[PDB]
Design a protein around this ligand. Structure first.
Ligand SMILES: [Mg+2]
Ligand SMILES: [Mg+2]
Ligand SMILES: [Mg+2]
Ligand SMILES: [Mg+2]
Ligand SMILES: [Mg+2]
Ligand SMILES: [Mg+2]
Lengths: 336, 72, 389
């Protein structure tokens, strides 16, 4: 396995460059992301397999995610704990080229549009999702997850009677105008940005009433998504229908990341607080609940702290992945 | 104080055979113990009373500077 | 501040993902529209006698949360819901096989035990029994008709007086199915502990006869194809129609209206009873519960007793109940007696997923036949085909 160590920093997200086959970036934070600086690491893998830092940027607060600019080979976005997102050009040192400041709390995710390749998305502890152009200071659109069951039972004057978190959001790589998100209220939200606010979202219960931490679109099947969360299950859904497959007890503790393979329609990867990374076969593409091994393909166990970041290699031998964790390690390995 | 409470709850909840051993040997869990006990507290830095010094990374101030539009 | 806020989130992910059902107590989930405070009183008695704490919760969407959480080993020890969802839970192996002895089983109506059977196993305790009845205005109609066949003549008399004989929801097949089933219609044939998803009774002669009668009432202007739940409820509760067809959930509104009403056996069709679908509120034990014996003791010796059901019932009425002794006590109310009578003459709601295919297809068929968009024969043929595709 190929390795790189980030001294004193914990990995929260990792992504391969969409332009350079041997380049990846890691978003990290000091003190397990709880307090102190953040740091963006730009890493290169050479012919030998040695991972080398080619650039890095220290930030004021912890970094929770990153997204490479799908339209510019030298640009990469980070999501920061102070509610900002910051866009960097890797040619420069020290500072970003743009700061995006609207979120009121920690930004936990950011993702680039793969269809138009122009815009990006952010999701925040403030309960909102924002769509941005890198060329504009102000957001283009704000989306707020509001499940029908949640909304109905919550008192309208809730904010003034003393008695939520959007962990991940993603653009569909199939439909320019579809956005999927998962919230701490256990609902996945599906937005069609063509429709007006208050009438643009469908919501569904995904993780037992416990926090839903992660969601991802299938790269080959337009209506197929996966979710993961605090009930230790991976669920696979058909949005045009909704549970088509379930992997109960996929992990021993909460699942922080799920991500579908960009090489196969039936392969996905999960990362967990149980300090493992697992590769799964979607057997419905029969279910995983009935199979003797639950469609488990590979269990990567080398991380010694919570695994928060995982990404599939785009180019090269299909089945290579990068994972990062609260052990300060980035590992590159083949899950087959 | 509130930080001490939360840390204690983590120690109590969460301290497979492989997973259990990994948690017992965890550096995060070790920090939770030290915050629970009152040794380590918030100085954007954490510090140990018994060591008198810093635990974890030093915080370095970072300006909200951006580069100008000088690069294609 | 910021650090403690972030750490609290991490803590919650860890605590909640590790937690399992606690040994030596009971957690019960029941819907918010049930007598959960009355159930909690039964819980207090159980605690007084045994030292076992009982916590009753009514989470939103509990019927969706249960199947998702059950594999983790967390969630409730006991779940209360309509029996028909328990089929899916049992298929997924989420419910413990219950062990009431022969003598205990004799304390409940035999047909109720069938509602809680899946693949040859008892998977829940029957609690309550719900079905549609005929509701009638005693001032307009002191002696309601025993047969569907009598309705046209009755409507002719009532229309002259500026009233109508009968208004009920024609949009939802749940309400029209009792007539369609009477002479032979059925959803799925049940044989050997299992519904045959290939044997559907939607376009048979009996279903055709029942729907034809319904459509003829409409053609002869004794009913209107557009009548839905609200139209019928308003008409009855305003004293404009002599009869409606509805369930025990509708009674409190009629009470408020002060209409002098009765609830009785549904009219027969071709000498055969109307057959409403029966819903059985049931209590299942989580297959992952470490407290299965405590749950059994609670359900059998505390809840399913006259004292236990009374406590729940006085909080929010259960309607008719599965327990013979308490049903006899309640049944001095003729409304409850009628509910049980109609339930005994009806059919248990099938507990399989293909019921949604049935409902969707039959909904279209009835609406199309009623509105004159299709003939009865064509409407039912198409529905039968769609279900069995
Ligand atoms: Mg990202
Ligand atoms: Mg629990
Ligand atoms: Mg509900
Ligand atoms: Mg018959
Ligand atoms: Mg209407
Ligand atoms: Mg008695």
């Amino acid at each position: 396995m190929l390795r790189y160590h980030m001294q004193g920093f914990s990995g929260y997200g990792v992504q391969y460059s969409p332009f350079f086959d041997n380049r990846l970036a890691v978003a990290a934070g000091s003190n397990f992301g709880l307090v102190g600086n953040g740091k963006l690491f730009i890493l290169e893998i050479d012919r030998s397999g040695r991972i080398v830092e080619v650039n890095s940027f220290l930030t004021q607060d912890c970094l929770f995610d990153l997204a490479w600019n799908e339209s510019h080979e030298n640009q990469v976005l980070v999501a920061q704990g102070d509610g900002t997102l910051r866009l960097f050009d890797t040619t420069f040192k020290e500072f970003p080229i743009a700061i995006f400041k609207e979120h009121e709390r920690e930004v936990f995710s950011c993702n680039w549009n793969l269809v138009n390749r122009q815009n990006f998305l952010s999701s925040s502890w403030d309960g909102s999702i924002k769509i941005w152009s890198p060329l504009r200071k102000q957001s283009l659109m704000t989306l707020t997850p509001r499940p029908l069951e949640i909304t109905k039972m919550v008192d309208p004057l809730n904010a003034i009677i003393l008695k939520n978190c959007v962990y991940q959001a993603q653009f569909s790589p199939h439909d320019q105008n579809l956005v999927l998100s998962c919230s701490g209220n256990s609902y996945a939200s599906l937005f069609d940005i063509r429709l007006p606010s208050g009438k643009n979202q469908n919501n569904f219960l995904v993780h037992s009433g416990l926090e839903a931490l992660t969601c991802d679109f299938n790269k080959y099947r337009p209506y197929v998504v996966a979710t993961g969360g605090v009930d230790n299950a991976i669920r696979i859904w058909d949005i045009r229908m909704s549970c088509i497959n379930e992997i109960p007890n996929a992990h021993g503790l909460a699942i922080r990341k799920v991500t579908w393979s960009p090489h196969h329609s039936n392969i996905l990867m999960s990362a967990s607080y149980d300090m493992t990374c697992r590769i799964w076969r979607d057997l419905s593409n029969k279910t995983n609940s009935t199979d003797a091994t639950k469609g488990s393909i590979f269990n990567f166990t080398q991380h010694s702290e919570f695994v928060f970041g995982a990404d599939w290699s785009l180019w090269g031998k299909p089945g290579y992945v990068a994972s990062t964790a609260w052990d300060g390690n980035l590992f590159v390995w083949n899950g087959l | 104080s509130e930080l001490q409470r939360i840390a204690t709850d983590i120690v109590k909840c969460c301290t497979s055979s492989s997973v259990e051993s990994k948690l017992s040997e965890s550096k995060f869990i070790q920090l939770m113990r030290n915050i629970s006990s009152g040794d380590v507290t918030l100085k954007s830095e954490l510090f140990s009373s018994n060591n008198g010094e810093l635990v974890g990374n030093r915080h370095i101030f970072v300006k909200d500077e951006i580069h100008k539009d000088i690069l294609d | 501040g910021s650090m403690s806020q972030r750490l609290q989130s991490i803590k919650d992910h860890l605590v909640e993902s590790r937690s399992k059902i606690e040994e030596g107590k009971l957690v019960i989930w029941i819907n918010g529209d049930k007598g959960y405070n009355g159930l909690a009183e039964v819980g207090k008695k159980f605690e007084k006698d045994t030292g076992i704490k009982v916590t009753v919760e009514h989470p939103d969407k509990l019927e969706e949360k249960f199947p998702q959480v059950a594999a983790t080993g967390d969630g409730p020890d006991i779940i209360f819901w309509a029996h028909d969802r328990f089929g899916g839970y049992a298929q997924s192996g989420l419910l413990a096989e219950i062990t009431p002895d022969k003598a205990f089983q004799d304390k409940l109506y035999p047909f109720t035990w069938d509602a809680v059977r899946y693949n040859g196993k008892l998977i829940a305790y029957p609690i309550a029994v719900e079905a549609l009845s005929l509701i009638y205005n005693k001032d307009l109609l002191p002696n309601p008709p025993k047969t569907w066949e009598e309705i046209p003549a009755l409507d002719k008399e009532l229309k002259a007086k500026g009233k109508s004989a009968l208004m009920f929801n024609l949009q939802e097949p749940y309400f029209t199915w009792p007539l369609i089933a009477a002479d032979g219609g059925y959803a799925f044939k049940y044989e050997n502990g299992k519904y045959d998803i290939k044997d559907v009774g939607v376009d048979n002669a009996g279903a055709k006869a029942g729907l034809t009668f319904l459509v003829d009432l409409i053609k002869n202007k004794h009913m209107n194809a557009d009548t839905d739940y609200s139209i019928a409820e308003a008409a009855f509760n305003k004293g404009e129609t002599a009869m409606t067809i509805n369930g025990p959930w509708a009674w409190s509104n009629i009470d408020t209206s002060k209409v002098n009403y009765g609830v009785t056996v549904l009219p027969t069709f071709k000498g055969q009873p109307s057959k409403p679908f029966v819903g059985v509120l049931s209590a299942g034990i989580n297959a992952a519960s470490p407290n299965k014996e405590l749950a059994k003791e609670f359900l059998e010796n505390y809840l399913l007793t006259d004292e236990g059901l009374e406590a729940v019932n006085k909080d929010k009425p259960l309607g008719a109940v599965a327990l013979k002794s308490y049903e006899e006590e309640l049944a001095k109310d003729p409304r409850i007696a009628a509910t049980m009578e109609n339930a005994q003459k009806g059919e248990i709601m099938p507990n399989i997923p293909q019921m949604s295919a049935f409902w969707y297809a039959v909904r279209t068929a009835v609406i199309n036949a009623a509105s004159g968009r299709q003939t009865v024969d064509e409407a039912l043929k198409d529905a039968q085909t769609r279900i069995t595709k």
